[PDB]
Structures are given as structure tokens and as C-alpha cells.
Amino acid sequence: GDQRKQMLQKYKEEKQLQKLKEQREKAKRGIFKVGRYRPDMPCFLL
Amino acid sequence: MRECISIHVGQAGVQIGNACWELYCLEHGIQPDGQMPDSFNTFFSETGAGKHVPRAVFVDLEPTVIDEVRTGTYRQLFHPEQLITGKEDAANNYARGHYTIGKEIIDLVLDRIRKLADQCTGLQGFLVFHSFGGGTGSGFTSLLMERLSVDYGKKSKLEFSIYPAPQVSTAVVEPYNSILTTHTTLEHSDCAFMVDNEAIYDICRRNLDIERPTYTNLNRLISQIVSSITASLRFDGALNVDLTEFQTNLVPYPRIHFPLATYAPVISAEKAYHEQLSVAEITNACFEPANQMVKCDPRHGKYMACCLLYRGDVVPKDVNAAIATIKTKRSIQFVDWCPTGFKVGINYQPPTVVPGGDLAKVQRAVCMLSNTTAIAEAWARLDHKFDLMYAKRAFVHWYVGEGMEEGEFSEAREDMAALEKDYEEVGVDS
Amino acid sequence: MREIVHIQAGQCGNQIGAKFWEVISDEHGIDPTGSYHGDSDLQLERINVYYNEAAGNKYVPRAILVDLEPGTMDSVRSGPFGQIFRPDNFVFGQSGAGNNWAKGHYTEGAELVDSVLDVVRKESESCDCLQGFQLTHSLGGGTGSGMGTLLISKIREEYPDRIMNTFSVVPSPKVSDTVVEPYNATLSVHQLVENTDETYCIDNEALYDICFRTLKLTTPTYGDLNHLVSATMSGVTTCLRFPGQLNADLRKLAVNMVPFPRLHFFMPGFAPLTSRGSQQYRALTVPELTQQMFDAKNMMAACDPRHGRYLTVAAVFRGRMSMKEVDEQMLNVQNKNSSYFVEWIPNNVKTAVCDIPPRGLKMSATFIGNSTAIQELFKRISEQFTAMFRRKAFLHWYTGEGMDEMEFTEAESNMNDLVSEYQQYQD
Amino acid sequence: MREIVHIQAGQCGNQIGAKFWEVISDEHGIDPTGSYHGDSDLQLERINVYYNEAAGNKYVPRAILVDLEPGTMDSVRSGPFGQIFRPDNFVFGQSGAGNNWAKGHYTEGAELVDSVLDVVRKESESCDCLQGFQLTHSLGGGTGSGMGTLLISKIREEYPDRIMNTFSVVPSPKVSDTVVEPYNATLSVHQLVENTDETYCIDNEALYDICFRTLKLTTPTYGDLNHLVSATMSGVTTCLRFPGQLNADLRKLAVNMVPFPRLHFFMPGFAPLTSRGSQQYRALTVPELTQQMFDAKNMMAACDPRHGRYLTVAAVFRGRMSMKEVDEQMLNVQNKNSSYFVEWIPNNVKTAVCDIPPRGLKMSATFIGNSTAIQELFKRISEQFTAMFRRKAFLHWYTGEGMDEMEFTEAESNMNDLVSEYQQYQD
Ligand SMILES: Nc1nc2c(ncn2[C@@H]2O[C@H](COP(=O)(O)CP(=O)(O)OP(=O)(O)O)[C@@H](O)[C@H]2O)c(=O)[nH]1
Ligand SMILES: Nc1nc2c(ncn2[C@@H]2O[C@H](COP(=O)(O)CP(=O)(O)OP(=O)(O)O)[C@@H](O)[C@H]2O)c(=O)[nH]1
Ligand SMILES: Nc1nc2c(ncn2[C@@H]2O[C@H](COP(=O)(O)OP(=O)(O)OP(=O)(O)O)[C@@H](O)[C@H]2O)c(=O)[nH]1
Ligand SMILES: [Mg+2]
Ligand SMILES: [Mg+2]
Ligand SMILES: [Mg+2]
């Protein structure tokens, strides 16, 4: 049964690796988006 | 001159402030729209002609209760910039109220406080209203109080807090926030008044025979307490108590600034006729362990200093008689190093009654604020709950994920432990 | 301002969401044409949490209706209040999952889900300060379970700091609609463990049992079940949508009910629930609401709380109510039943009170309970899955669609780990 | 006063021009007979930009109707608002270009360009202060593509300081109607590159995609496509025809969108474009105009903007709107999509706002964008031309009446050079 859990860990690692690779590929260019402003907070004397 | 600024943080603080300002408007004759058809200069600033704006500020990370104020019957009393509103609630999280959500709203409320403080010329101090349980009322209150400490400095800081009850509490993650906020309140506060909701409930059930009281009665009682606190400054009396004198007489050591407030006589209309409410008997009822608004036992505690604030038809001689009778009672004991431990304040004007309120009109009223060691037991079981929940690291991630570490959890724990040790070693005989 | 985006996946999810939108438009006074005909300003002072202001002084839901069969879409549109939804939010394919989690998560749902992501993206960008998303879906089918799970994963990837809600109906061993329910449930629960902030475990057994013994309803159809789920969904967010003595948004319940990140499976409940014949013989008071909430029969998951320990309990009250007696009732509940509450958490019950009650009642309460009795709901699913997994039963559909047996093995391992952690926090 | 002379070449150009005159006369309140019947006085102070004063309070367009097949002008005259045109502005031959750029440019275009130039000379000398010309044509045929290119060249030596504006329907790989589209398109681009100040690349594929997914139009005929093109044409000159908060004539858009003289191929668009059933559910504000007009599906070219970088964009807003909202929306578009805009040009957006909206709508926006996605739209034509040119396919036609292989070679070289420079400035 130890071989089965070793294969479990290996499969989870491979899935995490491919998911991280896809995330890195996606993060290079964000998708086009449009929304409201969220204006910057004013600065005060302090 | 002789002004003080009220700060209301959290839902509890905002509702208590609503009750307080309704009571103040009733006291000074100011209508809810601000027009009065002198002594009101303490809490209200006169703008232009026939317009009084309270020297207050309302802060929340959620828009429910603030917008309730903005649409309520007192919407004309406050200007919109006085009521500051966030977008997302702290959600019972000290981390959220202190680091993530409190950082982008602290600057604006401090600017409002600055613009409200330079307007007055005799600022006595600040009145911060909050609760220990809430994430906003803990985290943002701690942040605002440390900013006020670093900004104003020697100005007095008086805060009113809703300490959690031993058994009556409505938040699961409450002890974490309660420990964390006190960890900074120990050094950024000058006098922290303590109130338990369960004790208000017990007083309402017994004295005012209300079978189903809700938060409005609690806020009315707290508003009466704060009005009795500020009456010596908003009016004239035989013996006047100022905030600085209050702190000097009530706080013996810098870390010991957590007195317990009691108010008397708090009775219904039908029970008032049969009672000849004398000064001596209300003074005795102040020391009754059933009338404390903190769920604790003064009998197993030891008194260190108490301030007696009288308002109404009260002359000093019967006050001296009542105090002398109190001294002769063995059930109420005081520390040896405080041979005289009574600060006396008499005010001529009687406490007013809010229309629709449960309290009855009384000729005399007493608000005693005693700094005693009975709150060591309160700190003790709050700390036991904190330890018992922190052993399993429950809810810790809900704070760690918001710019916060376990190391300061432990440091707040040991700071509280040092606090109980301080109370224990000041309560011993010499 | 703390607005919520609603998504419905599958036939059950779509029907539950349609009923929820009907009851929440009744609560906010929105007619089936979308215009406002309410009486109180409190119905509009928080109208942006669920509705988008359209031109013409009328409102459209912030809902995206998702399925893989156009038939459910047509049924939802054709029914009452079905015109209020924006037509472009209706996202559907043509083939359908066919009770295949693989077809709903890897090939056909994956092909369709780009449009769903685009629509939820434009909805989240149009609104002011989004706080989270809520999804209604099943776990027995392939459309709901698989494609809603994919949608949850995508949303969590795009919005990692927002709160996920899933009013998900779980399969049950006695009323088992389909043959492949445990496969679909296990595969969905895999990603619902980590990709959802909190999940509401509902199932048809407890709903039917309520309609039998509590409501005394002779022949309840799916409409009454969906109405119950809708009432609970509305009572969860009534603190967001209306003022109250003590407010509690979804994040506050999340931080007060999830001590550890993987324990966010709750049994919902609603009170009061009385039959028509017993309506006049019952007293209008808060202690009987508390008793109706805390008894085993009112639970909407087929888990008896007496077999487990409560970790955290939520009680979102509605109506003009007193706080002292509510707190006293909760204290008595925690005192008389100290054995049924976890010992290392003092004050196991969080209380929230709203002032606006549901229509037709002057007082109501919503029960949300996090208890270790949930573990047996996963025990039964896991043992059914293990029974079909030793013999490779029905696996050829998923394998031919593109999956592999090791995905099933690791999903089972994940559920077994969750069950073990619930057991070892039960003590 | 800042008059515009309109020329229409080919059947497509004449159809789009007839629809454009339809919508313009609707804007200015000109009846089918050409006489004023509008209500607002704002419809008359700028009537001379497109119309001439006839005897008896009658308005005739400044339009030249050019084609080789007389049937097109027969149809234009016989249709609605078709008698408004001047009878002798109609110029026609008898043969027809026969889908041949060569015969539309050399053998039967030349004998007609003399008359066309005489007519446009009369119109230009009649007008007070000319600012430029408008030509509507398609690149697929021989009349439109070939003879319009010739006409543009002739106008350029005759009026080099006036602005050259053309609205050119380019061929698409999906919507392909004639076999020799690559030849005509390449030969026409070879002259639109250096003979035009701004070119609005229209295409039928994107227009059909609009009429499918955006307008939800069941059976889009050419009338609807020409209506969209006419709406864009009216949008680009609204500031000339009406007052506004910010005014931007053709030259201002040209100077704000042509960083280098050869990159004057713009990707047009319009907003709002709503379905009949869906317009009832849509909020109508500046942000929703902004999100529609920047959406890749809304664009009037068969090239995804996400595949390239915006050199410059123009937002010719119409209607009573706040300038803070407009400028802030443009700011947000530029910030959250910094990867889609050229870094060496800060403030990539040119914004103009008029106050007179199109009839039936209270606000509208015309998107114009100078993007680097034109490179692939031209590479499609280039590769089709190369495929048809290695094998000498159909070259015997063009060579039959004066053209030679070197002209095709230089046209392909010019298109390749323009694609390469778009790629270079894309980086
Ligand atoms: N409480 C409710 N349960 C429902 C309802 N409709 C269906 N169901 C139950 O949900 C389960 C199946 O869910 P669905 O039929 O919605 C499956 P889905 O369409 O999501 O997937 P596919 O069938 O593979 O497309 C099964 O137990 C049904 O009896 C409903 O309106 N309410
Ligand atoms: N958007 C539109 N495209 C049109 C319209 N009419 C034609 N076309 C398209 O134009 C393309 C070819 O242009 P035309 O048919 O007008 C050719 P033209 O008359 O300019 O030259 P010859 O016919 O060779 O003399 C072809 O794809 C047609 O479908 C129209 O009204 N709108
Ligand atoms: N006495 C009294 N206590 C109140 C009242 N309202 C709330 N509280 C107390 O406040 C505690 C929670 O804090 P809240 O004020 O409700 O919320 P908050 O301060 O805004 O912080 P958040 O939880 O993040 O919203 C509860 O445990 C209550 O005991 C009130 O009207 N009167
Ligand atoms: Mg709060
Ligand atoms: Mg289905
Ligand atoms: Mg032709």
C-alpha cells in the first residue's frame, strides 16, 4: 500500500506543477477588464 | 471653552452614542433638527445662527447603523462628514479592524477629529465609545486610541466599553478580540469604564421589572451614566468634578484605570412612589453587589478609590453622613494605603427622563465609579476562556491571514497576565 | 456595497435560485416585471446587494443562470418572476452533462465555462464593492456538481479574497435519484473542501421529513423544498439587506463558525415552521423558536446532531425582538446540553438579530450549525463510492471522457481525511 | 463652413452612402423631398457641412454618386430619400468593372474619372471652406476598390492639404463573396496606404457577428449592416455638425490618432448596440457605453484587439454627459489594461463629447481605435494574394488590359512593409 500512497503524492505533485505552470503562463498578460474608478484616498496633513 | 469630543466606534458605540445624543438634546433643550427655541457649549458647537452641531464623530466599517442615523430623526443634527462609513465590516476580526480595513479610513477620521478639536479652545479630552467583542470596536478603537495618544498626548482619553459577560455573549471569537484590544488599552487609555450587558439585563429585570429589554434600554442606561459623568462639567454644582480631577482621584497607578460604574436610583414609575429616595439609601444602593453594571462580586474584591457623582436636590452634609455610614460597614472594605477614598461631586440639576424611557423621574441620582479589584476576576475568566480557546489554535488563521502573527497573540496573553498580577499585588495588605 | 453575485448550476440549482429570487423580490417588493412597488424605504436602502439599477426605475437580479440543457433555461424564463433576469446572463449549451462529472468538469462544461466566466466578470466589475459569490448546485448530477465545481475553482482563482457560498444539495442513501450520485458527490466535495469558503449541506431527506412531520403537508412537491431552501438563503443575508440591533454579514459568520479552514460544512435550519391546522395552537415567542431551531427534526441535512458535537452555531434572528431573553435562551441551550457542544470553545453559539421579519411572519430565525455530525453524511457517500470503486463500476464513462482512476482515488483520500479530522475534533 | 464632399463608389459604397444620407437627414430633420421640417434650431447652423442650399428652402446633399453599372444609381434614386440627390451628381458608364481592379483603374475607370472629377470640382469650388472628402467603397470589386483608389489619388493631387477620409469594407476569410478579392484588396491597399489620411476598415464578418451576438437580429440583411456603418459615419462627424463640451473635427482625430503617417487604418465601433428584448434590462450610463465600446465583440473588424496593442483610441461621445465620468472611465480603461496599450504613448485615448445624441437614444459613443491588430487582417489578404500569385492565378485578366506582374509585386511588397511596421511598433 505504500507504493499507492507514493503514487498519490507523485500525482498530486504533478497536478500542482502543471497548475502552477498554467497560472504562470496566464499571469504574463492579464485579461482585458473595465470597471469603475475606486478613487485614491485624499492625503491630509500629519 | 471646557469642551470634550465624543467618538463612537462600532455598532455598540454608534447606538450608545445615539442614545447619549438624544439624552443630551433633551437635557439642553436642543431639538433633533439642531434648533434651540451657555452651558451647552461643552458638547455642541453653535454654527451660524440657531444651529448646534454635536462635537461627536461616528465611525463604522459597515454602512447599516450609520445610514440608519443618516435617515433617522436626528439626521439634521450631524453633518455628513461627521459620520464616517467604511465599505466592508471588520467582521468580528481584530486583524481586519486594525490592519487591513482600518488603515484606509483612519486618516479621514483623524482629519475630522483634528478639524473638530481646533474649533474648540478648551478641549478637556475625548470620549471613545466602543465594545470589546466587535472586530471594529476592538481593532479600530485600538488603532484610533494609539493615533490619538501619539498625536494629542497629554489630552485626557476616557473610553466606555462593553466588556463581555461571563455567560451572556454573542460572539464565538470574542475572547481573542477582547484580549487584543486591552493589550493596547492598557497604555493608550487614561480611564476605561467597564460595562457588562448581562449586568444591565439583571438590573432591568429586577429594578425596572422589564421582562423583555433590548439594546435600546441598555444604551439608555449607559447614556444616563455618561450624562452623570459630564453633568459636573455641563452645569454648576456645589462640588464640581472635572475630567483631570476625576483621573487624579480615581486612578492610583498608571495601569490601574478600569473602574466599575454604578447608577442609582434606577426604578420604574410605579415603584418610585412607595420609595422615599433619600441620599443615604441611594448611596447604600450604589455599593450593593446587585446594582453593579459589571457582572462581578465586590465582596471578594477590595475597593481602592470611588468617585461619587451626585445630581439633584443634594446637600453635602447628608452625603458626608452616607459616606460615614458606608465606612462603618464591614462588608465594604478599602485598601489600607488609601485612608480616604471618596471623591464627592454634587450637582444641582436633576437627571432628566427621556420620553418613552423606562426610568422614572427622580429628585436625586448617584453615579458611583469605583476602582476596585473585583474586575481581576473578570480579567481572570476572560483569560481562562482565551487560553482554553487558544490551546487548539482555533480561529487563529482568521487573524493571521490579515497582517497578524501568533507572537503578538502570546504577547497580549502575557500582558494580560501581568495585568492580573498587578491587580493582585496592589490588592494585598501591607 | 457588499453586493452578492448569484449563480445557479444545473436543474436543481436553477429551480432553487428561481424560487430564491422570487421570495427575495417579494421581500424587497419587486413585481414580476421588475419595477418597485414596495411600501417601506428599507426595501430600497439595500437594494444594490442583489439587484442592478436598470434604466426606468426598475431592477434586475445580479444572477447568472447556468445549465447545459436549454430546457431548464426555458422553464426558468417561462415561470413567474422569470422575466426579471437579464437575458444575456442565461448561459447554456446544447448537449448536457448526462450525469457525468467528467462531461461537466473536463470537456463540455469546460468548453462552455468561458462564457460563464465572462458574464460573472462583467457582473463583478459593474458592481461597486463585491464581497463574494454564492452558487446553488447539486452534487448528484454532472452539470450542477461538476460544472459548478469548475466555476468555483475559476472564481476562487480570480477572486481569492472573496467569500464563497454554496447552498449545495447532497445525495442521500434513501431518496437516491440516480445511480452515480456518490461518484459525482465525491468528485465535487474534493474541490468544495478547499475552493469554497463555507458550504451549506442540504439534502432531500431532511426537506421531505420537514414537509411530512413539521409542515404536515400531504403531497409536497419540489416547490416546497425549494421554498424552504430559499427562505434559509434569504435569512442568511437578511443582516446584509436590512438593519438590525446586531448585524452580521457573511464574513462575520465565516470567521465565527470556521475555526479551521476545512470545517465549513453546515446544517441549515429555519424557524418557525408550523402546519396550517396547528398555527393557532402555537405561541408567538422566542423560546419556542429556539426550541424549534435546536431540535434534530428541523435540520436540513440528514444528520442527527445528537450523534455529534456542535463546534459553532449561528442563529440569525429576524423581527422586533428582545436581546436579553435571546441571550438567556442561548445560555440555557448551551448549559442544559453541554455534552452536545464542543468543550474547548466557550460560547459555541453566535447570535445575530435583524429587525425586518419575513413577509407574513412577525418573527423568524435561521439556524446555521457547524457540528461533527456532518461526518456521517460523508461516511455514507464514501462507503457507497468505495462499494462501486472496488469493482470499477460505471468508471468507464469518466475514463473515456478523459479522467483517470487516480483522480477518484485522491478524491476519496481527501474525503477520508476530512472525515478523520471531523472525528478527531469531535473527541 | 468646414464642408465635406461625399463620394460613393461601387454598389456597396452607394448602398452604405444611401443609408448614411438616410441617417444624416434624420439627424438634421430633412424630409424625403429635401426640405427642412425639424424642430430644434441646432439642426440648421451646421447644415452646410453635408448639404447645399437650393431655391425654395430646399437642401441637396454634397454627394457624388459614382459607379459603372447604372443599376446601382437606379436603385439609389428609386429608394427612399433617394430623390434628394442632385440629378447630375449621378455619374455612370455602361459596362461595369467586372470585379476587376484593372478595368476599374485603367480601361473604363479612366474615361469616367474625368466626369467625376469635374463634378467634385464643381462641388468643392461651390463650398465655402472645404475641409476634406469622404469616400465609401469596398475592396472586393473593381469599381469600388479600383476606381475609388484612382479617385482618391486624383483628389490628392488636386487637394493635398484637405483631409482624405474613407470608409472601406475590406474582405474577410469567412465572408468571401468574390474569387479575386485578394487581388483587388491588395491593389487597393497599395494606394490607400499613401493616399488617405484615415481609413475605417469595415468588414462584413464583424458586422454579421454584431447582428448575431450583440443585436440578436434573426435575419440581418445588408440594410442593417449599412445602418451600423452609417451610425459610425455620423458619429465621426457629430462634432462638426453639432456643438459640444469637447469638439473634435476630422483633422483633430487624424492628428490625435496618426503618430506616423502610414498607420491610419482605424478599427471603428459604436455603442450602445442592444437587442430589442435586452435593451429593457440594461442600465444606460457612461460606464456601460465604455465597457461596450471597448469590447472585442463590438468591434467592426475581423481582428481581435487583445491580439495587439492600441496605438491610439478615440471616444467621440454624444449626449448630455458628465466630463468627469467620461475622462475617468477612459483613465480606468488605460490603467487596468496597460498591457494592451503602447507604453511610449501616455494618454492613449482621445476623448470628444457632443451634446446632441442620435435620434431615439439619449447618449451614444463611437469607438475608433488605431490598434496593431490590423496587421493580421492584412496578413490574411497578403497570404491569400501570395497563394493566388505564385501560380499566376487569374493574372491573365488583370494583365489583359495594361497591368503587369511588377505592379502586383510592388503592391504585395507595400502591404508586407505596412504589416512589418505595425509589428515593429507593437513590440
Ligand atoms: N431540493 C430539490 N432537489 C431537486 C430539485 N430538482 C432536482 N432535485 C434533485 O437534485 C438531484 C439531481 O439534481 P439535478 O436534476 O439538478 C442534476 P444537474 O441538472 O445539476 O446535472 P445533469 O442532470 O447531469 O445535467 C436529484 O436528487 C433530484 O431529485 C429541486 O427543485 N429541488
Ligand atoms: N456591408 C455591405 N457590404 C455590401 C453591400 N453590398 C455589397 N456588399 C459587399 O461588397 C462586396 C463587394 O463589393 P460590391 O459587390 O459593391 C463590388 P463593386 O460594385 O464595388 O465593384 P463591381 O461590382 O466589380 O463593379 C461583397 O462582399 C458584398 O457582399 C452592402 O450594402 N453592405
Ligand atoms: N450594551 C450594548 N452592547 C452592544 C450593543 N450593540 C452591540 N453591542 C455589543 O457589541 C458586541 C459586538 O460588537 P458590535 O458593536 O456589535 O460590532 P462592531 O463593534 O462594529 O465590530 P464588528 O463585529 O466587526 O462589526 C456584542 O457582543 C454586543 O455585546 C448595544 O446596543 N448595547
Ligand atoms: Mg459592527
Ligand atoms: Mg441535469
Ligand atoms: Mg460593381
- Write the CATH number for C390: 1.10.287.600
Whether residue B111 and residue A44 make contact (CB cut-off 8 A), yes or no, is yes
Alpha-carbon distances, residue D133 vs D3, D45, D72, D121, D151 (angstroms):
9, 20, 21, 12, 11
Q: B254, B338 in Cβ contact below 8 A?
A: no
Specify whether C224 is located in the same domain as C281: no
Contact C126, C170 (CB under 8 A): no
- Element holding B429 (H helix, E strand): none
Q: What 3-state class would DSSP assign to B84?
A: strand
Give me the residues of B, 90-119, that contact A with CB < 8 A: 104, 107-108, 110-111
Are the C-beta atoms of B388 and B338 separated by less than 8 Å? Answer: no
Give the separation between CA C183 and CA C411, rounded to whole angstroms: 10
Which one, of C99, C114, C185, C197, lies nearest residue C154 by Cα? C114
Tell me how many residue pairs between chain A and chain B have CB atoms under 8 A apart.
Answer: 11
Q: Are B56 and B119 in contact (CB under 8 A)?
A: no
To test ligand 1's pocket by mutation, which of C12, C181, C210 has the most ligand atoms within 8 angstroms of CB?
A: C12
Q: Which residues line ligand 1 (CB under 6 A)?
A: C 10-12, 15-16, 68, 96-99, 138, 140-144, 169, 177, 204, 207, 222, 225-226
A12 close to C (CB below 8 A) = yes
- Same domain for C332 and C412, yes or no, is no
Residues of C in contact with D277 (CB under 8 A): 87
Q: Which residues in chain C are contacts of A34 at CB distance < 8 A?
A: 125
Between the CA of C246 and the centroid of ligand 3 the distance, in Å, is 7
Grid cell in block for residue D37: 421640417
Q: Which helix (H) or strand (E) holds D138?
A: strand D130-138
Whether C283 and C359 share a structural domain: yes
The C-alpha cell at D247 is 469638439
Chain A nearest-CA residue for C404: A11
From the CB of B161, is ligand 3 less than 6 Å away?
A: no
Does one domain contain both D267 and D237? no
Contacts of D230 (CB under 8 A, 6+ apart): D16, D19, D20, D22, D23, D24
CA atoms within 13 A of residue C67's CA, in its CB half-sphere: 22
Q: Is C29 annotated as a binding residue?
A: no
Contact yes or no for B110 and A41 at CB 8 A: no
Angle at D55 between CA D54 and CA D58, to 5 degrees: 50
Best of A36, A37, A38, A40 to substitute, by most chain D Cβ atoms within 10 angstroms, is A37
Of ligand 1's listed atoms, the one at least distance from the Cα of C96 is 25
End-to-end Cα spacing for chain A: 65
Both C363 and C408 in one domain: the answer is no
Separation of alpha carbons B18 and B222, rounded Å:
11
Q: How many domains does chain C have?
A: 3
- Asked if B86 contacts B62 with a C-beta cutoff of 8 angstroms, the reply is yes
Distance CA C40, CA D372 (A): 54
User: Catalytic residue at B377?
Assistant: no
CATH of the domain at D328: 3.30.1330.20
* Residues near C393 by beta carbon (within 8 Å), at least 6 away in sequence: none
Single-letter amino acid, residue D325: E
Distance (Å, whole) CA C104 – CA C67? 10
Angle (nearest 5°) at CA B186 between B182 and B190: 120
Angle of CA points B240, B241, B242, to nearest 5°: 120
Residues forming beta bridges with residue C60, ordered by sequence position: C52
Grid cell of B388 as nine digits: 482554553
Interface test with D, best of C33, C57, C84, C88 (most D CBs within 10 A): C88
Chain A partners within 8 Å of C409 (Cβ) = 4, 8
CB D210 within 8 A of CB D295: no
DSSP one-letter string for D33-70: TSBB--S-GGGTTT-TTTEEEETTTEEEE-EEEE-SSH
The residue out of C331, C347, C373 marking a domain boundary is C373
Whether the CB of C278 is below 8 Å from some CB of chain A: the reply is no
Residue bearing cell 445624441: D357
> Do B248 and B343 form a contact (C-beta atoms < 8 A)?
no
Q: Would you say B304 and B255 are in contact if contact means Cβ atoms under 8 Å apart?
A: no
CB B59 within 8 A of CB B109: yes
- Between the CA of residue B159 and those of A25, B183, B226, D374, what are the distances in Å? 53, 15, 10, 67
Non-local CB neighbours of C285 within 8 Å, separated by 6+ positions: none
Å from CA of D12 to ligand 6 middle: 8
Q: Which ligand is closest in space to the CA of residue D104?
A: 2
> Do D108 and D213 belong together in one domain?
yes
Q: Is B262 helix (H, G, I), strand (E, B) or coil?
A: strand
Q: Residue D384 belongs to what domain range?
A: 374-427
* Three state DSSP letters for C315-382: EEEECCCCHHHHHHHHHHHHHHCHHHECCCCCCCEEEEEECCCCCCCCCEEEEEEEEHHHHHHHHHHH
Handedness of CA D328, D329, D332, D334 (dihedral sign): negative
Tell me the nearest-neighbour CA distance from C125 into chain A, angstroms: 5
Rounded to an integer, what distance in angstroms lies between the CA atom of residue C339 and that of residue D287? Answer: 57
Q: Which of C55, C88, C125 sits opposite D283 (nearest CB)?
A: C55
C57 torsion bin: left (phi>0), alpha (psi -120 to 50), beta (else): left
Give me the half-sphere count of Cα atoms (radius 13 Å) on the Cβ side of residue B218.
Answer: 25
Type of residue at C125: E
Query: Which residue owns the Cα nearest ligand 3 atom 30?
Result: B12
Considering only CA atoms, which of D251, D248, D233 is closest in space to residue D162? D251
Experimental method: cryo-EM
In this complex, does chain D touch chain B, defined as having at least 3 beta-carbon pairs under 8 Å apart?
no
Does any ligand 3 atom lie closer than 6 A to the CB of residue B133?
yes
Angstrom distance (rounded) from CA D226 to CA D416 = 30
Asked if B394 lies within 8 A of C2 by C-beta distance, the reply is no
Q: Do residues D386 and D275 both lie within one domain?
A: no
If you search the block for the grid coordinates 468571401, which residue do you land on?
D176
Distance CA B57, CA B141 (A): 13
D206 and D96 in one domain?
yes
Q: Which of D407, D410, D394 is nearest to D179 (CA)?
A: D394
Do D109 and D173 fall within a single domain? yes
The residue from D203, D228, D259 where one domain ends is D259
Provide the pairing of β-strand D51-54 with D58-61: antiparallel
Give the dihedral sign, CA C206/C207/C208/C214.
Answer: positive
Interface of C with B in 160-219 (CB under 8 A): none
- Strands across the sheet with D63-66, in order? D90-91, D63-66, D3-9, D130-138, D163-170, D198-203, D265-268, D364-371, D310-318, D349-353
Q: Which three cell numbers stand for residue C184?
A: 459525482
Whole-angstrom CA distances from D285 to A31, B43, B316, C51, D231 are 23, 44, 71, 16, 19
Touching chains, A (3+ CB pairs < 8 A): B, C, D
C206/C212 Cα distance (integer angstroms): 10
- Out of B46, B146, B198, B245, the active site residue is B245
- C-alpha to C-alpha distance for B2 and B125, rounded to whole angstroms: 9
Tell how far the Cα of C23 is from the centroid of ligand 5, in angstroms. Answer: 24
Resolution of this deposited model, Å: 2.8
Instruction: Tell me: do D347 and D391 sit in the same domain.
Output: no
Q: Which of C354, C373, C392 is the last residue of a domain?
A: C373
Judgement on whether residues D38 and D98 belong to the same structural domain of the protein: yes
Alpha helices by DSSP H, C196-257: 204-209, 222-241, 250-257
Residue C112 sits in a domain whose CATH number is 3.40.50.1440
From the CA of B301, how far away is ligand 3's center (Å)? 28
Q: Are residues D283 and D424 part of one domain?
A: no
Written as nine digits, the cell of C324 is: 436579553
Q: What are phi and psi of D109, to 5 degrees?
A: -70, -40
Nearest CA in chain B to C320: B214
Is the CB of residue D269 less than 8 Å from the CB of residue D368? yes
